[PDB]
Each structure stands twice: as structure tokens, then as C-alpha cells.
Design an enzyme around this catalytic site. Structure first.
Site, PDB file in Angstrom:
ATOM      1  N   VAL A  17      -7.252   1.316  -0.232  1.00 11.95           N
ATOM      2  CA  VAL A  17      -7.243   1.069   1.495  1.00 11.95           C
ATOM      3  C   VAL A  17      -5.827   1.811   2.031  1.00 11.95           C
ATOM      4  O   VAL A  17      -6.228   2.112   3.133  1.00 11.95           O
ATOM      5  CB  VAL A  17      -6.999  -0.431   1.802  1.00 11.95           C
ATOM      6  CG1 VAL A  17      -8.268  -1.205   1.398  1.00 11.95           C
ATOM      7  CG2 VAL A  17      -5.602  -1.083   1.273  1.00 11.95           C
ATOM      8  N   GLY A  18      -5.015   2.372   1.072  1.00 10.68           N
ATOM      9  CA  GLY A  18      -4.127   3.307   1.551  1.00 10.68           C
ATOM     10  C   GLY A  18      -3.076   3.438   0.644  1.00 10.68           C
ATOM     11  O   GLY A  18      -2.530   2.524  -0.192  1.00 10.68           O
ATOM     12  N   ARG A  19      -2.159   4.414   0.843  1.00 13.86           N
ATOM     13  CA  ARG A  19      -0.817   4.730   0.149  1.00 13.86           C
ATOM     14  C   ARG A  19       0.210   3.803   1.242  1.00 13.86           C
ATOM     15  O   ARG A  19       0.356   3.917   2.269  1.00 13.86           O
ATOM     16  CB  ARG A  19      -0.302   5.893  -0.087  1.00 13.86           C
ATOM     17  CG  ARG A  19      -1.270   6.890  -0.838  1.00 13.86           C
ATOM     18  CD  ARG A  19      -1.411   6.435  -2.306  1.00 13.86           C
ATOM     19  NE  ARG A  19      -2.743   6.725  -2.636  1.00 13.86           N
ATOM     20  CZ  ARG A  19      -3.234   8.093  -2.888  1.00 13.86           C
ATOM     21  NH1 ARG A  19      -2.441   9.142  -2.921  1.00 13.86           N
ATOM     22  NH2 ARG A  19      -4.243   8.146  -3.390  1.00 13.86           N
ATOM     23  N   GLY A  20       1.364   3.260   0.379  1.00 14.19           N
ATOM     24  CA  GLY A  20       2.301   2.557   1.043  1.00 14.19           C
ATOM     25  C   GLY A  20       3.278   3.772   0.910  1.00 14.19           C
ATOM     26  O   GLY A  20       2.902   4.914   0.759  1.00 14.19           O
ATOM     27  N   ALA A  21       4.514   3.384   1.265  1.00 18.28           N
ATOM     28  CA  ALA A  21       5.853   4.408   1.150  1.00 18.28           C
ATOM     29  C   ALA A  21       6.053   4.732  -0.111  1.00 18.28           C
ATOM     30  O   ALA A  21       6.308   5.759  -0.336  1.00 18.28           O
ATOM     31  CB  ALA A  21       7.154   3.355   1.634  1.00 18.28           C
ATOM     32  N   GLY A  23       3.519   4.173  -3.973  1.00 17.98           N
ATOM     33  CA  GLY A  23       2.399   3.329  -4.769  1.00 17.98           C
ATOM     34  C   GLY A  23       1.263   3.610  -3.837  1.00 17.98           C
ATOM     35  O   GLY A  23       0.901   4.596  -2.880  1.00 17.98           O
ATOM     36  N   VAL A  25      -2.495   1.246  -2.481  1.00 17.88           N
ATOM     37  CA  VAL A  25      -2.789  -0.258  -2.354  1.00 17.88           C
ATOM     38  C   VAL A  25      -4.268  -0.261  -2.511  1.00 17.88           C
ATOM     39  O   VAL A  25      -5.072   0.657  -1.853  1.00 17.88           O
ATOM     40  CB  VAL A  25      -2.154  -0.706  -1.066  1.00 17.88           C
ATOM     41  CG1 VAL A  25      -2.556  -2.188  -0.846  1.00 17.88           C
ATOM     42  CG2 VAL A  25      -0.787  -0.573  -0.718  1.00 17.88           C
ATOM     43  N   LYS A  38      -0.948  -3.358  -5.500  1.00 17.64           N
ATOM     44  CA  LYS A  38      -0.190  -2.263  -5.280  1.00 17.64           C
ATOM     45  C   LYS A  38       0.110  -1.725  -6.712  1.00 17.64           C
ATOM     46  O   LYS A  38       0.799  -2.456  -7.440  1.00 17.64           O
ATOM     47  CB  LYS A  38       0.995  -2.553  -4.378  1.00 17.64           C
ATOM     48  CG  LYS A  38       2.025  -1.321  -4.208  1.00 17.64           C
ATOM     49  CD  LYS A  38       3.239  -1.614  -3.186  1.00 17.64           C
ATOM     50  CE  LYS A  38       3.694  -0.603  -2.698  1.00 17.64           C
ATOM     51  NZ  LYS A  38       4.776  -0.910  -1.426  1.00 17.64           N
ATOM     52  N   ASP A 131      13.800   0.719   5.993  1.00 13.33           N
ATOM     53  CA  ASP A 131      12.492   1.644   6.356  1.00 13.33           C
ATOM     54  C   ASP A 131      11.525   1.056   7.393  1.00 13.33           C
ATOM     55  O   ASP A 131      10.213   1.292   7.249  1.00 13.33           O
ATOM     56  CB  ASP A 131      11.942   2.014   5.232  1.00 13.33           C
ATOM     57  CG  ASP A 131      11.010   3.534   5.237  1.00 13.33           C
ATOM     58  OD1 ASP A 131      11.240   4.249   5.782  1.00 13.33           O
ATOM     59  OD2 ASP A 131       9.816   3.432   4.458  1.00 13.33           O
TER      60      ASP A 131
END
Ligand SMILES: CNC(=O)[C@@H](C)N(Cc1ccccc1OC(F)F)C(=O)c1cnc(C(=O)n2cc3ccc(C(N)=O)cc3c2)[nH]1
Length: 295
Positions: A17-21, A23, A25, A38, A131
């Protein structure tokens, strides 16, 4: 705080579903439940991974993303998943962008302040997020509910100058970030988009006192809060508890935050640029409702 140790084989890794800051996910199933996992990409993220694990296992709040458990082989976090998207995508993402109102903008900011005030009230020491920015804030429930993510700590535009000056700093850095975010949801503009080039250019600007431009027709009670939050001197910024109080008071003049985002918008940002910008949202109703109470 409690965590389920989870066996990697009883979870089904679905769609990324996308990258976190840090990792990456993925949506997934665990006991046939909607769940986000994650995982670290490289070995350099393992530290961030442990911080997040330790920090998130201590917290329980409706505006902070829930941690269900972990898997220590391979290393992965198992969190709540819900339908929605990042605040970043709601504000600035791909067509079609949703219409939203002053009430949504103010409610999103109240909700972030509530989650951060909880973090800052932790004993024996405040948990500082460090952040806060719209890519790390998730909207769920048809865009009405905001959840804070990414507790593992391109962020220069939201960073208090004491942090990147490498001074000592406090939980007041989060207040600076919240202030920039308040500006961002009201204007629907990317803070410091105009300052091109690499990050040190934003740092230089902000370090020298540059702030996002003033907003046309912004009520003085909101303006005053916003500008205190981005005070150079951290001691002149309000605490998050004070923010929550003020934003709670203000919300009585912003009915309709429980309305889902349901209408598309053709958002053409009008070049204000003579040192002032137009709000994306509308304040006429606020002023009407305020005058009803205050003459
Ligand atoms: C339009 N598409 C989007 O906005 C993508 C970027 N998105 C949000 C999203 C996904 C992964 C990583 C970050 C992220 O942005 C923000 F939500 F943190 C989602 O689609 C989405 C939908 N539902 C979720 C969700 O339930 N979670 C649950 C999460 C728990 C933790 C983290 C994290 N970064 O630590 C992200 C999480 C994203 N994410």
C-alpha cells in the site's frame, strides 16, 4: 505494554500500500482481519523498527494508529488497516482531489493535537513524535478521522529550527510542525514549495525566520494560534494541551466535520503571491457564527 507475538505463517501478505517514513507497508489478513504489516527493506531500518515497536507498544489513543503485534522472524509489525489514505494524498495527491471544508481542516488539526498531547503527557518522559507531516497522517472513516503514524524517529518543511540547528530540543518541536500543518490544510498548499533545490535551502530559510505566508481573511483567533506555534523561541509556543483546548473552543464555530469527503474538486490554486495567500477553505460561516455569540 502488551503485544501479540505473531507467527509469520498465519498472516497473508497482500498488496503493497506504500512506504512509510521507513519500511514498506502491505495490506494483509490475520485471523481473517484487515491488517497492515510493516517490514524493513534494508538492514539500516532495523533501529527505526525497534524504536517504533517499543514506542507504539506503550500507546493507546484513538488518533494514533493501533499496533496489534510483531513477528520476529522475519522482523515485521502488525497494525490496524482501514480504508482511506494519507492526508498528503487528500490534500495534494492524484486527481480527483476531494472537496473539503473549514470544518474538516480544523477537525483534522484538532485530532492531530489530541494524539500529540497524549504523547506529550506520557510518564516519565514525553514521547516526542519528531516527524509530524501530512505523509505520516492517515485519514480513515470517509476522511473524518485522523490517525498519527510513523513512530520510528524530506521533512525539512515541517521541522522546528532548533532540531536541524542540532540544538537540544523539547516536545515543542512537534508544536512547530503542527502549526505548519494548520497552515497547509487551510491553504491546501505545500509549505515552502517555491523554495527550490535541496533541503539545506529550506533549513536556511526557516533558520533565518522565514515562515509560510499569511492567509487572507484568516480569523485572528486562528492566526494568533498558528503564528505562536511557529515562534522561533520554543518557550513562546503553546503546549499541545493548550492547543487542544483552543481548537476545541474554536470547533463550536465549525459544524460539519463528521461529513464524509464525497465531492470532487478542481483545485486551481490562485497565485496570491503578494506576501499573502487565499485559504482553500471558507471562513464566512465562522464569522457569521461567531458574531451570533459575540455581537
Ligand atoms: C492514496 N493512497 C495512500 O494514501 C496510501 C499511501 N495509504 C497510506 C499509507 C500507506 C502506507 C504507508 C504510509 C501511508 O501514509 C500514511 F497513512 F501513513 C493508503 O492507501 C492506506 C489506506 N489505509 C492505510 C492504512 O490503514 N495504514 C495503516 C498504517 C499503519 C502504519 C503506517 C506507517 N507508515 O507506519 C501506515 C499505515 C497505512 N493506508
Amino acid at each position: 505494554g502488551s503485544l501479540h507475538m505473531i507467527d509469520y505463517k498465519e498472516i497473508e501478505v497482500e498488496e503493497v500500500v506504500g512506504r512509510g517514513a521507513f519500511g514498506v507497508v502491505c495490506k494483509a489478513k490475520w485471523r481473517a482481519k484487515d491488517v497492515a504489516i510493516k517490514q524493513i527493506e534494508s538492514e539500516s531500518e532495523r533501529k527505526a523498527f525497534i524504536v517504533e515497536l517499543r514506542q507504539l507498544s506503550r500507546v493507546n489513543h484513538p488518533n494514533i494508529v493501533k499496533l496489534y503485534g510483531a513477528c520476529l522472524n522475519p522482523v515485521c509489525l502488525v497494525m490496524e488497516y482501514a480504508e482511506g489514505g494519507s492526508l498528503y494524498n487528500v490534500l495534494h495527491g492524484a486527481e480527483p482531489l476531494p472537496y473539503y471544508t473549514a470544518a474538516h481542516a480544523m477537525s483534522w488539526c484538532l485530532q492531530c493535537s489530541q494524539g500529540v498531547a497524549y504523547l506529550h503527557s506520557m510518564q516519565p518522559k514525553a514521547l516526542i513524535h519528531r516527524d509530524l507531516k501530512p505523509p505520516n497522517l492517515l485519514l480513515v472513516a470517509g476522511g473524518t478521522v485522523l490517525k498519527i503514524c510513523d513512530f520510528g524517529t524530506g521533512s525539512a518543511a515541517w521541522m522546528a529550527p532548533e532540531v536541524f540547528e542540532g540544538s537540544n530540543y523539547s516536545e515543542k518541536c512537534d508544536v512547530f510542525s503542527w502549526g505548519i500543518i494548520l497552515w497547509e490544510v487551510i491553504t491546501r498548499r505545500k509549505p515552502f514549495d517555491e523554495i527550490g533545490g535541496p533541503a539545506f535551502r529550506i533549513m536556511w530559510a526557516v533558520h533565518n525566520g522565514t515562515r509560510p505566508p499569511l492567509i487572507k481573511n484568516l480569523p485572528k483567533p486562528i492566526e494568533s494560534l498558528m503564528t505562536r506555534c511557529w515562534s522561533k523561541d520554543p518557550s513562546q509556543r503553546p503546549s499541545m494541551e493548550e492547543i487542544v483546548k483552543i481548537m476545541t473552543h474554536l470547533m463550536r464555530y465549525f459544524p460539519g466535520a463528521d461529513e464524509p469527503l464525497q465531492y470532487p474538486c478542481q483545485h486551481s490554486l490562485p497565485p496570491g503571491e503578494d506576501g499573502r495567500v487565499e485559504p482553500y477553505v471558507d471562513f464566512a460561516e465562522f464569522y457569521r457564527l461567531w458574531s451570533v455569540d459575540h455581537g
